[PDB]
Design a protein around this ligand. Sequence first.
Ligand code: TCH
Ligand code: TCH
Ligand code: TCH
Ligand code: TCH
Ligand code: TCH
Ligand code: TCH
Ligand code: SIA
Ligand code: SIA
Ligand code: SIA
Ligand code: NAG
Ligand code: NAG
Ligand code: NAG
Lengths: 532, 532, 532
Amino acid sequence: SSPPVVDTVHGKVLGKFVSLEGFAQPVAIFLGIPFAKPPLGPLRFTPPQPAEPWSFVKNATSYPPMCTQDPKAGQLLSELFTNRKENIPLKLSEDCLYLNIYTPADLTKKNRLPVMVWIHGGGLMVGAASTYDGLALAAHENVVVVTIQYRLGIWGFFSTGDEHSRGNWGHLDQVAALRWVQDNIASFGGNPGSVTIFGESAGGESVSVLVLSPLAKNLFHRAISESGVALTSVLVKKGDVKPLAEQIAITAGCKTTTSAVMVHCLRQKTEEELLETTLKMKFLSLDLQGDPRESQPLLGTVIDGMLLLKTPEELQAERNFHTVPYMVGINKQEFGWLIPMLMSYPLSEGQLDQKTAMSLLWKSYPLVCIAKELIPEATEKYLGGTDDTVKKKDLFLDLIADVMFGVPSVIVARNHRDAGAPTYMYEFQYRPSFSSDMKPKTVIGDHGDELFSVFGAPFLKEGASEEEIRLSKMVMKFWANFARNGNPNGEGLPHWPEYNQKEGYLQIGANTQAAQKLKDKEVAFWTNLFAK
Amino acid sequence: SSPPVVDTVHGKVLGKFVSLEGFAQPVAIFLGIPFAKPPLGPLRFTPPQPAEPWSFVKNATSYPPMCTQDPKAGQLLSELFTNRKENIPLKLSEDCLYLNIYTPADLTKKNRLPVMVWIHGGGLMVGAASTYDGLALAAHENVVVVTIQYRLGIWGFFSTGDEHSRGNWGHLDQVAALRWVQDNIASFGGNPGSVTIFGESAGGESVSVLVLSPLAKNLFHRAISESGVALTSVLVKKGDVKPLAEQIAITAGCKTTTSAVMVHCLRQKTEEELLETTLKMKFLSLDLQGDPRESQPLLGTVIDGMLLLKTPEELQAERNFHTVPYMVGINKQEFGWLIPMLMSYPLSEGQLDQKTAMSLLWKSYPLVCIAKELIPEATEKYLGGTDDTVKKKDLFLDLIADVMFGVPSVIVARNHRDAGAPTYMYEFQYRPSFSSDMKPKTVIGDHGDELFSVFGAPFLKEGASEEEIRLSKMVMKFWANFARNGNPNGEGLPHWPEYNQKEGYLQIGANTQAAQKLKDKEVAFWTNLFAK
Amino acid sequence: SSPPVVDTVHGKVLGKFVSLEGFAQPVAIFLGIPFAKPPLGPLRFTPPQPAEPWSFVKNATSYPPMCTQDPKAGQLLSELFTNRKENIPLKLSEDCLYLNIYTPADLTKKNRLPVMVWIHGGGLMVGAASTYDGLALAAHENVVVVTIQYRLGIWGFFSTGDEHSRGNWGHLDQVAALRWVQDNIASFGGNPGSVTIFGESAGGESVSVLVLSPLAKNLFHRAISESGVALTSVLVKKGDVKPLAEQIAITAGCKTTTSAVMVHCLRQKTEEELLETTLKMKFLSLDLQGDPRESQPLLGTVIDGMLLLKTPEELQAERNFHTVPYMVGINKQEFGWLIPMLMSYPLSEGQLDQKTAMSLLWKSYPLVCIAKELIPEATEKYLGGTDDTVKKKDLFLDLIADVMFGVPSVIVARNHRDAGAPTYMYEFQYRPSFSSDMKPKTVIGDHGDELFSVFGAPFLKEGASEEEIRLSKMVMKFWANFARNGNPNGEGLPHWPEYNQKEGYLQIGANTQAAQKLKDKEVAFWTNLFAK
Ligand SMILES: C[C@@H](CCC(=O)NCCS(=O)(=O)O)[C@H]1CC[C@H]2[C@@H]3[C@H](O)C[C@H]4C[C@@H](O)CC[C@]4(C)[C@H]3C[C@H](O)[C@]12C
Ligand SMILES: C[C@@H](CCC(=O)NCCS(=O)(=O)O)[C@H]1CC[C@H]2[C@@H]3[C@H](O)C[C@H]4C[C@@H](O)CC[C@]4(C)[C@H]3C[C@H](O)[C@]12C
Ligand SMILES: C[C@@H](CCC(=O)NCCS(=O)(=O)O)[C@H]1CC[C@H]2[C@@H]3[C@H](O)C[C@H]4C[C@@H](O)CC[C@]4(C)[C@H]3C[C@H](O)[C@]12C
Ligand SMILES: C[C@@H](CCC(=O)NCCS(=O)(=O)O)[C@H]1CC[C@H]2[C@@H]3[C@H](O)C[C@H]4C[C@@H](O)CC[C@]4(C)[C@H]3C[C@H](O)[C@]12C
Ligand SMILES: C[C@@H](CCC(=O)NCCS(=O)(=O)O)[C@H]1CC[C@H]2[C@@H]3[C@H](O)C[C@H]4C[C@@H](O)CC[C@]4(C)[C@H]3C[C@H](O)[C@]12C
Ligand SMILES: C[C@@H](CCC(=O)NCCS(=O)(=O)O)[C@H]1CC[C@H]2[C@@H]3[C@H](O)C[C@H]4C[C@@H](O)CC[C@]4(C)[C@H]3C[C@H](O)[C@]12C
Ligand SMILES: CC(=O)N[C@H]1[C@H]([C@H](O)[C@H](O)CO)O[C@@](O)(C(=O)O)C[C@@H]1O
Ligand SMILES: CC(=O)N[C@H]1[C@H]([C@H](O)[C@H](O)CO)O[C@@](O)(C(=O)O)C[C@@H]1O
Ligand SMILES: CC(=O)N[C@H]1[C@H]([C@H](O)[C@H](O)CO)O[C@@](O)(C(=O)O)C[C@@H]1O
Ligand SMILES: *[C@@H]1O[C@H](CO)[C@@H](O)[C@H](O)[C@H]1NC(C)=O
Ligand SMILES: *[C@@H]1O[C@H](CO)[C@@H](O)[C@H](O)[C@H]1NC(C)=O
Ligand SMILES: *[C@H]1O[C@H](CO)[C@@H](O)[C@H](O)[C@H]1NC(C)=O
């Protein structure tokens, strides 16, 4: 009856009860709980700070703003990924360090349900936590779902390569939220002792990162990466970054006399100004002309010396870290449609040839980082198969899909396994009915397609075949089960082999059954082609 | 001789000696002593901070600037209230956290005279400490007089209802000055152990507030409210204030995305800008058209959760607080001329009728907060008396005068009495010869009229009848005596009955004699009319 | 070889090895090591703060920017003083609190060589540490040479005469660097226990200042002032400075309502803006028209109450301070050419007369501070000698040279001697072959001429007569020796008498031999002429 009121370390929070069809216990929902101090003014480009405690009762009943980002791009992605029926239009602001909590527990008791913290993707450029509705998953598997937000673009990843602005602000925000959960989740019926992180795309990469970070140690107990890991090069800036810093500085109208000078000048700029700079830059939009190597696609994770002490590669080559059950998965066709369409890929011809391929792959250097001396050899192994110009276009996509997620994922999984830690893999092959109209019916297992099963899209949206509804129920169980025991298995669900020496993984889809050696041939191949 | 030099915790202060006619020991006067760090830049809308200590000798010989406020309004009020012969023109600035000290002690000794700290009024919108000259009172009753300043308008009362800008900056400034006095007054011959706060209008309201605030506890030992208390609704913002915040924000040219966003944006604005916004808001002028309820008159005290933990009403219903001798007084005709004239009241006809009255009272909602369903009944009890349209105009004034000060004051006094604490009341009925020309000779005991007797106007200005001179001498004695023993009585002065169960109070004026049950009929009445 | 990497309290520093002709052990050189946090934003006009520690290895391999200053003036002086063959063009920035280290030690050992910290001159208006190359001196006398930088002009000396902006930021920066050396120099083979400060012109004045400052106590163990001391009036602002503050404020487009208001407003201004203001002020160029007394030449050292508790004069009249070996020297013709040419002195006629002299001396009031009632008498003692209009021009120069450096220096030296501390004086008379072309061959011992011998110019530049090369070798020995034992003497070098009661000093030049009572006649004279 009376709105739910929970007590947190910083003050009381007022939520709202929401009931899902066919469920007695209604879910308590809190929207916009702050987990850090608004990173405004001098706090820009600095680690997130603890939030100021409030004097009375804070109403967590309005969706928090999304971090500053390209408004069009953001709203668009929010629509294509949202698991709720009506997409919620959001506001933009630097004041976005909020998290949304969804608890199916009976607050009037001492419940200690498992917690699943979701890290939205968006290439570390755009995205939001309000996009994902935890209602379904919260109710169906009886787990507390938390959707966190973190600084994006410049605001969360600007780096000068030195102590004046190390960088990785966004990841720090992520860590911060995790501590908030440790220190508060208990009041929402969650068990701080069983926290599970999971995300997709950049969000999945972030999970991979936190699993390597000394800082994260002890903030979670199970991890899941969906279509995205740390070895996913494009998102990790290796090498001297100072140049990009100076570039951003200039475009923003700042001098570059010294690092300190740049950061200071940027701290002066208004959000609006920095947003225009973010636009001027043309990022995700894949540049075709000019020099492919000079084309800088973004500014993500970096080896700051705090969150990460060294490249992911070097890091995983060691087993001197707290290892936890890690689930690493990918989708049948990562580069099926969503991604290419969003970057404005020239493949709007529905066909390609060996010559136009090498050219395209080369201009794709910022997304695949392949030397132009290997391109021919790589193009050969994938396209030299058939003569059907259409098959080549599809093979070309698989090419990129393997370099960006395919191989990285498996490599990560193997290392984790070898480090002596529970590892699990999967390949989601299914075409959700919620797919966009502009998406061809032949694209199955496209980027983010799993999102709908994981977040129970069939129980919030409309017209889900019984098949889809069942698929979703199955995935949530696996996920939730993992979050519970660090093992997806359970009664009623197909057997999911652990990723050990036999390299078994689960193929999720219409026919969900186990398999082995995922992308084994590919990994083996690319590894050599990269050894030059 | 040699200018007076006193040592304070933050450094040496140089003053000036001023002799009053017929007094051997000249008074040492220090003007512009800082008691907090200039609330500039990022310090705006934040609690006042300790002042930076100075290296040599600071000359306290120039009147400090008055906090930013409507310059016309301010200078005008300064003239109508000033107790000195020539009104001193002041400067405006955000740097106004200063206090003026007036000590009749012989600094070359260890004097420990009682202290009286004066809080000027001005509706929390305008005012200044330099307006009041302590010379007379200081010399005549041998007490150290201190005139403090505190942030006004937006600068001192802007609030978003949450931790991003709780509010009550002004009251915090007031508390701050009080601590300064505890930590330093000893060096000017004052006794930190016997500090008495007193003020009028908003300043009187502030005294009432500090008497309820946990923060004030132990900073004073006697209190006096002249024509103004905490129950004086107009000055206390109860309810969700967020709306006014957003309104101010907009007028100032700021977004309203979140609270944090508003405060930050306002911190950017220049003083000039915020002053224009203050003007645009048309703060004091009473709006007649539009919806009377929508008309927002100001932005004063709020229930921040720091200075005040709950509404004054709720607070005084409890006796779990440090109680001190409290003197609560009012004047015969609070709404006689001063106030109406300053708000531009439509009563420039010298007469009114039952119908035009209810209309006027309704538009006066922001100043009386009376439901339009009671207005008729209220108008009846006061105006239904005679038919003389002129008498009604005068009765209408008394109506407001009772709701704004009359009843509140008495109720406050009663609660204080019942809380088991020395309580004293008075009703000042006299027409000072210093009254403005535009003030009719039939208005006696108008708002602020007591100010002239209290600050010894007859000994600084010119042409005071012996009667006025004597009246003043009498009031100062009562006041000073209270400041000394928490009891006005003393030899040579009429007997002042304590406000106990018989409800005795003192009628000050040409014929000063005791009386009983002040505004008893009214209180009783209004209480019911308000119980709907 | 592997670049030199040293560990400091704030992190690892990477340098570069540089070998000098005919020296086995190459010198390790580190350029741009930060010793304080960039004084940007709110840190402007505030004491320097500790630097932020870095996570990996900081490459100290690029010349740090020079503090904001008149670019033309700066580059010009850098050329005329530089001891290296090719003048290094620098960048301007508020981020300039860096120091350059030059160590001839074998970092692979526990070396503890003496340290010599150089404070460049430039009237506290311009200058840089990168101008002086320590390579030679470092190698030749086996001492660790450090060249520090400190805030200049407005940025480092703006003062309001009160706690809102005491001033002497620049000197504080200097002190700060010295603490850095105490806390870190050990890692570069230096001995924190044997630090020697030395500078020229304003830099020399600064040395004189640190020797009187309580703050400096224990940061050095030997001091050297070249052509510049604390009594050098022009550089020390005595009296109420508030006026200059308000002037600067106005020119910068700020109000002057209060001190706090001025400082705040100035903190807002951009570097560019303040640089334009610095230019508008026409600071170093000597004004001829208008009132000579009103002409304000600069804004240097002030009696802040922190760095300096009272005027140098009063201070040295006391012997209650830590006294160390102090070397005070001057050059034959301080006002020979460099200075006059740089202020745009009207003496471009190559001759003058008794009448035009008094007029010039008077307009020179901001540089000599002589009353117009003494000018005639002063002009007489120096010019009344011969009739040769040319001799007068030369005598006129000596006149100023004695008031600005000559007498002050000796007076300082005497006091130091009398305070019971090792004192040494010298008079450098030589014309370096590196002199500018526009410098007449008859000018010997011009301002800054010693700089070339001290920094080993003959070993870095080209075409040095064997005579010059030997002179330089000799000076470096004396200097280094002093830095070692607080006594210049040693085998192979002429005997340098200590400045005791006989007042012996060393005449350095082609024929280096001792002498006595330097400028004795002059001091005696001027002292009386000044006693009015
Ligand atoms: C954020 C998404 C697209 C947003 C877009 O805005 N639509 C297009 C143009 S818009 O002007 O306004 O119309 C996604 C879609 C595909 C994603 C990219 C690819 O999938 C490649 C990945 C590889 C990852 O591991 C790292 C991120 C990344 C290098 C990507 C960055 C980012 O998350 C992208 C680009
Ligand atoms: C972005 C859209 C273009 C809208 C535009 O107006 N053009 C329409 C027709 S044409 O192009 O100009 O010929 C879509 C509409 C249909 C899409 C194409 C077809 O649906 C065929 C697919 C096959 C996919 O698996 C790969 C992309 C793709 C090879 C396409 C590239 C692209 O996303 C297109 C061209
Ligand atoms: C400061 C004075 C006037 C301010 C004014 O702006 N002048 C008028 C027009 S101006 O364009 O430029 O000329 C005083 C005079 C009468 C005062 C008001 C009334 O007396 C009513 C009181 C009731 C109090 O308890 C609280 C303050 C208050 C609600 C007032 C706020 C304030 O102190 C006022 C308005
Ligand atoms: C603000 C002033 C108006 C100046 C204006 O130019 N009008 C002048 C004459 S008229 O109005 O237009 O009829 C003053 C001057 C005289 C004042 C009036 C009279 O003095 C009568 C008083 C009686 C008071 O106790 C109440 C206000 C009041 C009923 C008045 C309202 C108001 O303050 C007036 C009208
Ligand atoms: C830095 C030099 C000149 C600066 C100058 O600005 N150049 C000139 C004109 S500009 O664009 O070409 O316009 C030197 C040359 C002579 C120096 C001055 C004189 O030698 C007098 C000395 C006395 C010292 O003990 C203190 C510094 C000082 C009071 C000087 C300050 C400064 O170092 C000066 C002025
Ligand atoms: C600043 C220079 C002027 C360049 C200008 O174009 N004038 C050239 C010839 S004239 O002036 O116009 O007569 C130099 C060039 C030669 C210099 C002059 C001569 O060399 C004579 C010297 C003697 C010095 O010891 C004192 C300065 C000085 C008495 C000079 C003042 C000044 O620095 C001058 C005049
Ligand atoms: C500021 C605003 O208008 N939005 C609502 C906020 C939001 O939670 C946060 O702004 C983002 O979620 O929550 C409140 O209840 C609160 O914090 O007291 C106030 C308001 O109702
Ligand atoms: C106008 C003004 O008030 N500022 C004055 C301040 C005051 O000390 C404080 O403001 C408090 O009076 O400092 C002076 O008096 C002073 O030390 O010479 C001069 C200055 O004009
Ligand atoms: C952009 C630039 O060239 N500056 C250099 C700075 C300097 O340390 C400071 O500017 C002081 O010289 O930082 C480095 O040296 C470093 O720490 O690795 C790299 C860089 O080359
Ligand atoms: C206070 O002392 C300062 C410092 O000299 C001086 O400027 C000021 O005029 C003095 N105050 C007055 C006005 O007497
Ligand atoms: C640091 O300096 C070394 C040697 O000059 C160089 O190899 C390296 O690239 C530099 N690193 C940085 C931070 O640029
Ligand atoms: C927040 O929303 C709740 C509804 O649950 C409401 O009662 C409350 O008043 C709101 N906050 C305020 C005080 O405005």
